[PDB]
Design an enzyme around this catalytic site. Structure first.
Site, PDB file in Angstrom:
ATOM      1  N   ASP A   1      19.751  54.862  76.980  1.00  0.00           N
ATOM      2  CA  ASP A   1      18.697  54.043  77.573  1.00  0.00           C
ATOM      3  C   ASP A   1      17.845  53.494  76.435  1.00  0.00           C
ATOM      4  O   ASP A   1      16.969  54.185  75.910  1.00  0.00           O
ATOM      5  CB  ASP A   1      17.862  54.867  78.548  1.00  0.00           C
ATOM      6  CG  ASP A   1      16.805  54.041  79.270  1.00  0.00           C
ATOM      7  OD1 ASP A   1      16.686  52.827  79.001  1.00  0.00           O
ATOM      8  OD2 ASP A   1      16.083  54.620  80.110  1.00  0.00           O
TER       9      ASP A   1
ATOM     10  N   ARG B   1      26.762  59.239  74.163  1.00  0.00           N
ATOM     11  CA  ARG B   1      27.656  58.591  75.119  1.00  0.00           C
ATOM     12  C   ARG B   1      26.935  57.507  75.915  1.00  0.00           C
ATOM     13  O   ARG B   1      27.522  56.464  76.227  1.00  0.00           O
ATOM     14  CB  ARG B   1      28.262  59.626  76.067  1.00  0.00           C
ATOM     15  CG  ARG B   1      27.237  60.370  76.904  1.00  0.00           C
ATOM     16  CD  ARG B   1      27.880  61.105  78.062  1.00  0.00           C
ATOM     17  NE  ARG B   1      26.883  61.767  78.893  1.00  0.00           N
ATOM     18  CZ  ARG B   1      26.233  61.173  79.886  1.00  0.00           C
ATOM     19  NH1 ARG B   1      26.472  59.899  80.167  1.00  0.00           N
ATOM     20  NH2 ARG B   1      25.339  61.847  80.597  1.00  0.00           N
TER      21      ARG B   1
ATOM     22  N   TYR C   1      21.253  71.041  77.286  1.00  0.00           N
ATOM     23  CA  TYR C   1      20.805  71.185  75.907  1.00  0.00           C
ATOM     24  C   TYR C   1      19.959  72.442  75.754  1.00  0.00           C
ATOM     25  O   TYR C   1      19.056  72.704  76.554  1.00  0.00           O
ATOM     26  CB  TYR C   1      20.001  69.963  75.458  1.00  0.00           C
ATOM     27  CG  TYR C   1      20.406  68.639  76.055  1.00  0.00           C
ATOM     28  CD1 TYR C   1      21.458  67.907  75.524  1.00  0.00           C
ATOM     29  CD2 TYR C   1      19.707  68.099  77.127  1.00  0.00           C
ATOM     30  CE1 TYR C   1      21.818  66.682  76.058  1.00  0.00           C
ATOM     31  CE2 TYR C   1      20.059  66.878  77.668  1.00  0.00           C
ATOM     32  CZ  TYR C   1      21.115  66.173  77.132  1.00  0.00           C
ATOM     33  OH  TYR C   1      21.463  64.956  77.673  1.00  0.00           O
TER      34      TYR C   1
ATOM     35  N   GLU D   1      10.017  68.857  73.696  1.00  0.00           N
ATOM     36  CA  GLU D   1      11.371  68.893  74.236  1.00  0.00           C
ATOM     37  C   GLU D   1      12.360  69.460  73.223  1.00  0.00           C
ATOM     38  O   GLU D   1      13.288  70.185  73.598  1.00  0.00           O
ATOM     39  CB  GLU D   1      11.802  67.491  74.670  1.00  0.00           C
ATOM     40  CG  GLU D   1      13.213  67.414  75.237  1.00  0.00           C
ATOM     41  CD  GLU D   1      13.763  65.998  75.251  1.00  0.00           C
ATOM     42  OE1 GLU D   1      13.209  65.139  74.534  1.00  0.00           O
ATOM     43  OE2 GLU D   1      14.746  65.744  75.979  1.00  0.00           O
TER      44      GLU D   1
ATOM     45  N   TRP E   1      11.368  65.475  82.150  1.00  0.00           N
ATOM     46  CA  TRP E   1      12.446  66.098  82.907  1.00  0.00           C
ATOM     47  C   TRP E   1      12.045  66.385  84.351  1.00  0.00           C
ATOM     48  O   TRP E   1      12.651  67.244  85.000  1.00  0.00           O
ATOM     49  CB  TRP E   1      12.905  67.385  82.220  1.00  0.00           C
ATOM     50  CG  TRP E   1      13.772  67.150  81.022  1.00  0.00           C
ATOM     51  CD1 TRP E   1      13.378  67.130  79.716  1.00  0.00           C
ATOM     52  CD2 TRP E   1      15.184  66.906  81.020  1.00  0.00           C
ATOM     53  NE1 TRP E   1      14.456  66.885  78.901  1.00  0.00           N
ATOM     54  CE2 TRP E   1      15.576  66.745  79.677  1.00  0.00           C
ATOM     55  CE3 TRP E   1      16.153  66.806  82.023  1.00  0.00           C
ATOM     56  CZ2 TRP E   1      16.897  66.490  79.311  1.00  0.00           C
ATOM     57  CZ3 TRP E   1      17.462  66.553  81.657  1.00  0.00           C
ATOM     58  CH2 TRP E   1      17.823  66.397  80.314  1.00  0.00           C
TER      59      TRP E   1
ATOM     60  N   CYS F   1      23.669  63.581  77.062  1.00  0.00           N
ATOM     61  CA  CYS F   1      23.715  62.220  76.536  1.00  0.00           C
ATOM     62  C   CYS F   1      23.931  62.222  75.025  1.00  0.00           C
ATOM     63  O   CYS F   1      24.896  61.633  74.529  1.00  0.00           O
ATOM     64  CB  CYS F   1      22.436  61.469  76.916  1.00  0.00           C
ATOM     65  SG  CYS F   1      22.320  61.143  78.685  1.00  0.00           S
TER      66      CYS F   1
HETATM   67  N1  LIG Z   1      17.902  57.409  83.072  1.00  0.00           N
HETATM   68  C1  LIG Z   1      17.356  58.425  82.315  1.00  0.00           C
HETATM   69  N2  LIG Z   1      17.432  59.689  82.628  1.00  0.00           N
HETATM   70  C2  LIG Z   1      16.815  60.545  81.729  1.00  0.00           C
HETATM   71  N3  LIG Z   1      16.759  61.912  81.840  1.00  0.00           N
HETATM   72  C3  LIG Z   1      16.066  62.428  80.764  1.00  0.00           C
HETATM   73  C4  LIG Z   1      15.675  61.383  79.959  1.00  0.00           C
HETATM   74  C5  LIG Z   1      14.890  61.502  78.673  1.00  0.00           C
HETATM   75  C6  LIG Z   1      13.580  60.739  78.762  1.00  0.00           C
HETATM   76  C7  LIG Z   1      13.007  60.158  77.611  1.00  0.00           C
HETATM   77  C8  LIG Z   1      11.794  59.447  77.706  1.00  0.00           C
HETATM   78  C9  LIG Z   1      11.136  59.306  78.952  1.00  0.00           C
HETATM   79  C10 LIG Z   1       9.844  58.544  79.078  1.00  0.00           C
HETATM   80  O1  LIG Z   1       9.309  58.419  80.181  1.00  0.00           O
HETATM   81  N4  LIG Z   1       9.361  58.035  77.924  1.00  0.00           N
HETATM   82  C11 LIG Z   1       8.194  57.251  77.669  1.00  0.00           C
HETATM   83  C12 LIG Z   1       8.335  55.977  77.060  1.00  0.00           C
HETATM   84  C13 LIG Z   1       7.219  55.164  76.789  1.00  0.00           C
HETATM   85  C14 LIG Z   1       5.933  55.619  77.122  1.00  0.00           C
HETATM   86  C15 LIG Z   1       5.774  56.880  77.723  1.00  0.00           C
HETATM   87  C16 LIG Z   1       6.884  57.709  78.003  1.00  0.00           C
HETATM   88  C17 LIG Z   1       6.605  59.062  78.660  1.00  0.00           C
HETATM   89  C18 LIG Z   1       5.783  59.985  77.753  1.00  0.00           C
HETATM   90  O2  LIG Z   1       4.632  59.736  77.405  1.00  0.00           O
HETATM   91  O3  LIG Z   1       6.483  61.100  77.397  1.00  0.00           O
HETATM   92  C19 LIG Z   1      11.719  59.886  80.101  1.00  0.00           C
HETATM   93  C20 LIG Z   1      12.929  60.598  80.005  1.00  0.00           C
HETATM   94  C21 LIG Z   1      16.162  60.183  80.580  1.00  0.00           C
HETATM   95  C22 LIG Z   1      16.103  58.735  80.271  1.00  0.00           C
HETATM   96  O4  LIG Z   1      15.542  58.291  79.271  1.00  0.00           O
HETATM   97  N5  LIG Z   1      16.711  57.932  81.167  1.00  0.00           N
HETATM   98  O1  LIG Z   2      18.537  62.062  75.812  1.00  0.00           O
HETATM   99  C1  LIG Z   2      18.771  61.174  76.610  1.00  0.00           C
HETATM  100  N1  LIG Z   2      18.996  59.914  76.188  1.00  0.00           N
HETATM  101  C2  LIG Z   2      19.258  58.917  77.056  1.00  0.00           C
HETATM  102  O2  LIG Z   2      19.445  57.813  76.570  1.00  0.00           O
HETATM  103  N2  LIG Z   2      19.304  59.161  78.396  1.00  0.00           N
HETATM  104  C3  LIG Z   2      19.581  58.166  79.456  1.00  0.00           C
HETATM  105  C4  LIG Z   2      20.825  57.277  79.213  1.00  0.00           C
HETATM  106  C5  LIG Z   2      21.143  56.814  80.646  1.00  0.00           C
HETATM  107  O3  LIG Z   2      20.245  55.784  81.064  1.00  0.00           O
HETATM  108  C6  LIG Z   2      20.883  58.102  81.448  1.00  0.00           C
HETATM  109  C7  LIG Z   2      22.184  58.890  81.617  1.00  0.00           C
HETATM  110  O4  LIG Z   2      23.261  57.979  81.844  1.00  0.00           O
HETATM  111  P1  LIG Z   2      24.240  58.642  82.935  1.00  0.00           P
HETATM  112  O5  LIG Z   2      23.360  59.456  84.004  1.00  0.00           O
HETATM  113  O6  LIG Z   2      25.014  57.586  83.622  1.00  0.00           O
HETATM  114  O7  LIG Z   2      25.255  59.652  82.214  1.00  0.00           O
HETATM  115  O8  LIG Z   2      19.904  58.866  80.686  1.00  0.00           O
HETATM  116  C8  LIG Z   2      19.074  60.436  78.849  1.00  0.00           C
HETATM  117  C9  LIG Z   2      18.814  61.447  77.996  1.00  0.00           C
HETATM  118  F1  LIG Z   2      18.595  62.698  78.465  1.00  0.00           F
END
Ligand SMILES: Nc1nc2[nH]cc(Cc3ccc(C(=O)Nc4ccccc4CC(=O)O)cc3)c2c(=O)[nH]1
Ligand SMILES: O=c1[nH]c(=O)n([C@H]2C[C@H](O)[C@@H](COP(=O)(O)O)O2)cc1F
Ligand SMILES: NC(=O)C1=CN([C@@H]2O[C@H](COP(=O)(O)OP(=O)(O)OC[C@H]3O[C@@H](n4cnc5c(N)ncnc54)[C@H](OP(=O)(O)O)[C@@H]3O)[C@@H](O)[C@H]2O)C=CC1
Ligand SMILES: NC(=O)C1=CN([C@@H]2O[C@H](COP(=O)(O)OP(=O)(O)OC[C@H]3O[C@@H](n4cnc5c(N)ncnc54)[C@H](OP(=O)(O)O)[C@@H]3O)[C@@H](O)[C@H]2O)C=CC1
Ligand SMILES: CN(Cc1cnc2nc(N)nc(N)c2n1)c1ccc(C(=O)N[C@@H](CCC(=O)O)C(=O)O)cc1
Ligand SMILES: CN(Cc1cnc2nc(N)nc(N)c2n1)c1ccc(C(=O)N[C@@H](CCC(=O)O)C(=O)O)cc1
Ligand SMILES: Nc1nc2[nH]cc(Cc3ccc(C(=O)Nc4ccccc4CC(=O)O)cc3)c2c(=O)[nH]1
Ligand SMILES: O=c1[nH]c(=O)n([C@H]2C[C@H](O)[C@@H](COP(=O)(O)O)O2)cc1F
Lengths: 506, 506
Positions: free
Chosen positions: B411, B408, B327, B279, B301, B387
């Site tokens: 998660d 901002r 990004y 990423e 994504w 974010c």
């Molecule tokens: N709400 C919300 N929207 C998002 N849009 C984009 C993101 C970024 C993001 C970052 C991490 C992961 C994720 O699945 N991690 C993970 C954690 C533990 C074990 C395995 C995996 C998956 C893997 O092996 O890769 C997914 C999305 C993001 C977000 O974190 N939250």
């Molecule tokens: O790089 C990242 N880091 C992160 O923490 N989020 C999480 C935070 C939140 O749970 C969600 C976005 O919040 P919101 O859609 O309300 O702006 O994605 C997403 C990413 F892409």
């Protein structure tokens, strides 16, 4: 041999405690503090003794206090034995018979008047002092709290509270007379030099630590700034910059400030509050004309808006005080093609401030309330890139408005006291327009530095024990955020130390 | 009756301490720690006693240690009286005669082998344990450190250090058996409810505090994340958001991480390091095609790049995985008119990443090394607003590259472990291209929250005592930052706890 503590509420400067046989203020929370601090006991089969003079005994209506034994010092009152909760002694010395015998008394409190306070410290009976500093001074007093002798040292200073627009603190003065973890960290610090991150973030020495005796009770949020001042003096690397004046710089710091019960305006130095507001409303209105601030006797943007500075940075064709697209042009007209400070930009660009207000009251729990000023396309046209770069706002579940500010560069001598108050006022303005109460203010700093010509001044500021924050209230509710005026702001209870002069590095 | 402490260096998982009569590693700083921890004395007229088995006595060449008295436990060695710095006892029990008499011995240390360690804990002689956890496991051992009995509790855990790409920690285990300031703060907390800012930032309870016995020695920088996890569980307000899954949210937090001697990759949960890199290089290259990540088996994504999610946010005309300008498009082509993910944008927009690298090595002490992603003009075209919004970089006087990141929304279950590692890798890449060493990483967070479906998982993660950070090194030096590949990254010494599954809220 038990504990003897003084409980008192005095004014911040003159230490006045009474007037015409009564208190010069009515603070409900202070009376609750007195009630809980004098009832605090460990043995349920014992009571606490409250020593007070006769005139104070008249002030409380000559009626006993629940769960406590009042000890009245008077030469005329009859030593009555009817009321078991009230006892009379002829002098203060005899009243300290609670020590020798009467094991049913656990603690002793001296909450008398000037007559009792004075000869309780002079006779050296007091172990602790519970001081309630009140920010009222331009009134009349006739009874004062004696000066705290040098044998006492402050060990705690609470945050500033508010009651009926009156600010007050809570301090504790005490009379002065495991290692296995600390040694291991020291040994690791000798092995690894700057490889151990702890050595890059050393604790400030006592000679640069504001009020060093307050170790575990640095609750007052002015310490969030005075200790950042100390951390820079300890770890600051000597570095040069675009100006001729070098700085001592560290990277990555933060400060928290309460805005519900106080206003984060520094008290260790008189801060020009009017110039701060006139700059903030200058941003809000969208103005970039540097002369409009000079016409209002605000000269903070004169150094970066002179004819010699503009020609030095490659903007010689620009007008005298035409600072260009800066704060207040990215707020109101983001990505707008800037020409001069005289043109009309109404309609062009993205109005962040308007969309910010519209989002704060139509979707409070949104996580995108962001006001930015960093525009890479317009950086070359700016007289000075944005320092307070980006800010995010947050609505709590109890309808309060908090604010987070990231600051890439922070002049801890000049810009920092302004940035603290400026974004505090801005958060309060947004709260009134959106129908919220002020919340918290967190400032995240990148390059926190101190200019080397400010060393003598900032060390003087660190020698001043902080005073309670003032209060800032608005006189009227405006319909639009642009309608704020300097006459609408009322600064209540600001009694700072004398101002300190520091030259700006252009 | 004096102090008896165990000093040992064991592997992180299997607790191996030796192989073929010698140590399975050569760590110079560890030997210095042993030398300083065993020479630490308060009386200059006394010496410390070092108990060790015979085979350990053979390992050090049968030569005395300076300023110390070595006590050898052996049934065959002759009780020689020639060397006054070496004494031999027949059994361990008799050797603890240093207690009863011999007042010239101040402290006792048990740095023997498995035979001596085992019957020193079984006989209940040990008061303290100085453990040096080493991150080497896929080697061969034949002598192990016995399991620490439940009577001991950890009280300190140092930061992760590095020597020859080997990570190691320092822990202290101890055998378990003023109030005036704390009471006043409690009383003020009863008077003012949420008016006292301390009550809005309560200390986490023990049941949600990772490794509660380590109170004053939370030096390991994984605690910067595990304690933020605890602060949210304590003060998090239940709030709804744009998704159906509500969160527990607090506002204004920060985390610090060292990158000189370690790599901030969490050990309490196995983090997919490959997906993080793929990423990050996806951002650096300027790519916005969401399928290129799916082609590399990276599905982070996919939720925000589906056909149903794009039509739900008003981007139905957009292609399947065309995330839009996000990004890597504000990094490389800021303010560029975005069309689709297939067009060629080479030349359009402001290339921040290029100007960032050019400024980092041509003007290191500049205070403007800022990479932003918040573009109000392009927010409406994004599948998800940024974010990790803005980042600032800093070159220290010793040629190290630090990084500050403002976030901002965070998660804490999914995005936070990724954002910590992602911006750590990015700082290391910028350091190699600019000719610097990695420095520090500070992350400033706005809306720090925990999704309610992650409560059972994150409480499981909090029950795992952290392990030392791994090391991350690059196999080759690239000429341009875009040339990095997954084969170039070598992750050394990563022994985490089993991975934890957590669903993403779309
Ligand atoms: N709400 C919300 N929207 C998002 N849009 C984009 C993101 C970024 C993001 C970052 C991490 C992961 C994720 O699945 N991690 C993970 C954690 C533990 C074990 C395995 C995996 C998956 C893997 O092996 O890769 C997914 C999305 C993001 C977000 O974190 N939250
Ligand atoms: O790089 C990242 N880091 C992160 O923490 N989020 C999480 C935070 C939140 O749970 C969600 C976005 O919040 P919101 O859609 O309300 O702006 O994605 C997403 C990413 F892409
Ligand atoms: N802000 C605060 O925390 C407090 C404020 N106050 C205020 O202070 C004012 C009253 O204090 P103040 O005017 O100083 O009077 P005091 O409360 O100190 O008491 C005075 C009386 O105590 C007796 N007394 C004092 N010294 C001696 C002595 N050496 N030997 C014998 N008797 C002695 C005398 O009684 P006698 O003449 O009968 O012999 C004297 O008249 C009030 O306004 C009250 O509200 C009071 C308490 C706390
Ligand atoms: N990582 C670390 O911190 C350390 C690692 N090591 C490593 O461990 C290895 C050696 O340890 P190890 O193999 O367990 O041997 P030991 O160091 O524990 O010593 C063994 C000897 O101690 C004597 N001994 C043990 N128990 C008794 C008893 N109950 N009564 C009388 N004598 C006793 C015996 O000597 P005898 O037969 O002569 O009577 C025995 O042979 C080496 O590789 C060494 O490098 C050693 C110290 C520290
Ligand atoms: C005039 N006087 C002296 C007085 C007033 N304010 C103070 N304030 C402080 N901080 N310290 C003092 N020693 C003090 N003393 C008073 C007035 C009222 C009560 C009183 O009524 N106390 C009740 C509390 C009433 C309530 O809870 O509001 C109690 O339970 O002790 C005591 C002393
Ligand atoms: C084989 N052995 C046992 C050994 C090795 N590593 C350990 N490491 C730890 N953390 N703890 C131990 N008890 C320990 N014991 C050794 C090896 C060398 C020295 C030694 O030479 N110590 C010197 C230190 C040498 C130097 O400063 O580098 C000293 O002054 O005590 C001691 C014990
Ligand atoms: N290097 C560099 N460039 C800057 N460009 C713009 C700024 C902002 C700024 C903020 C404050 C002041 C200032 O003089 N404050 C001050 C402090 C104490 C007493 C009196 C005054 C003046 C007064 O009564 O108003 C000047 C400039 C700024 C900066 O702070 N540092
Ligand atoms: O609001 C401001 N706050 C501030 O701290 N400065 C100071 C910080 C620094 O001393 C200088 C700008 O640093 P630089 O010119 O290197 O970016 O202005 C300026 C402002 F306008």
């Amino acid at each position: 041999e038990k504990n003897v503590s003084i409980v008192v509420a005095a004014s911040v400067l003159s230490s006045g405690i009474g007037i015409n046989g009564q208190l010069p203020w009515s603070i409900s929370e202070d009376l609750k503090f007195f009630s809980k601090i004098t009832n605090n006991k460990c043995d349920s089969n014992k009571k606490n003794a409250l020593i007070m003079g006769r005139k104070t005994w008249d002030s409380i209506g000559r009626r006993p206090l629940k769960n406590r034994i009042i000890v009245v010092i008077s030469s005329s009152l009859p030593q009555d034995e009817a009321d078991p909760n009230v006892v009379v002694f002829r002098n203060l010395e005899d009243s300290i018979e609670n020590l020798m015998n009467d094991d049913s008394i656990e603690n002793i409190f001296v909450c008398g008047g000037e007559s009792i306070y004075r000869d309780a410290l002079k006779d050296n009976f007091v172990d602790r002092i519970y001081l309630t500093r009140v920010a009222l001074e331009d009134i009349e007093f006739d009874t004062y709290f004696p000066e705290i002798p040098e044998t006492f040292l402050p060990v705690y200073m609470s945050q500033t509270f508010c009651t009926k627009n009156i600010s007050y603190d809570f301090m504790i003065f005490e009379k002065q007379e495991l290692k296995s973890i600390d040694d291991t960290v020291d040994l690791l610090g000798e092995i690894f030099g700057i490889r151990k991150m702890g050595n890059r973030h050393k604790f400030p020495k006592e000679e640069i630590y504001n009020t060093p005796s307050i170790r575990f009770g640095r609750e007052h949020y002015e310490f969030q700034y005075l200790d950042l001042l100390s951390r820079v003096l300890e770890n600051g690397a000597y570095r040069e910059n675009r100006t001729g004046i070098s700085t001592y710089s560290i990277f990555g710091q933060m400060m928290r400030f309460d805005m519900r019960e106080s206003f984060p305006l520094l008290t260790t130095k008189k801060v020009a509050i009017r110039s701060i507001f006139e700059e903030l409303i200058w941003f809000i209105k969208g103005d970039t004309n540097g002369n409009h601030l000079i016409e209002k006797k605000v000269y903070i943007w004169s150094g970066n808006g002179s004819k010699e500075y503009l020609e030095r940075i490659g903007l010689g064709h620009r007008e005298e005080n035409d600072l260009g697209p800066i704060y207040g042009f990215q707020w109101r007209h983001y990505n707008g093609e800037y020409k001069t400070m005289h043109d009309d930009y109404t309609g062009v660009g993205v109005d962040q401030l308007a969309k910010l207000i519209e989002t704060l009251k139509n979707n409070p729990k949104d996580r995108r309330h962001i006001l930015t000023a960093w525009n890479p396309s317009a950086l070359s046209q700016m007289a000075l890139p944005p320092c307070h770069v980006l800010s995010q706002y947050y609505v709590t579940n109890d309808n309060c408005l908090s604010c987070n500010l990231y600051q890439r560069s922070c002049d801890l001598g000049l810009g920092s006291p302004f940035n603290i108050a400026s974004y505090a006022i801005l958060t309060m303005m947004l709260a009134q327009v959106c129908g919220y109460e002020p919340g918290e203010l967190a400032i995240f700093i990148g390059d926190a530095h101190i200019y080397e010509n400010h060393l003598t001044q900032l060390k003087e500021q660190l020698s001043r024990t902080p005073r309670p924050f003032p209060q800032l209230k608005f006189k009227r509710k405006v319909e639009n955020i642009e309608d704020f005026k300097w006459e609408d702001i009322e600064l209540i209870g600001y009694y700072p130390y004398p101002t300190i002069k520091m030259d700006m590095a252009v």
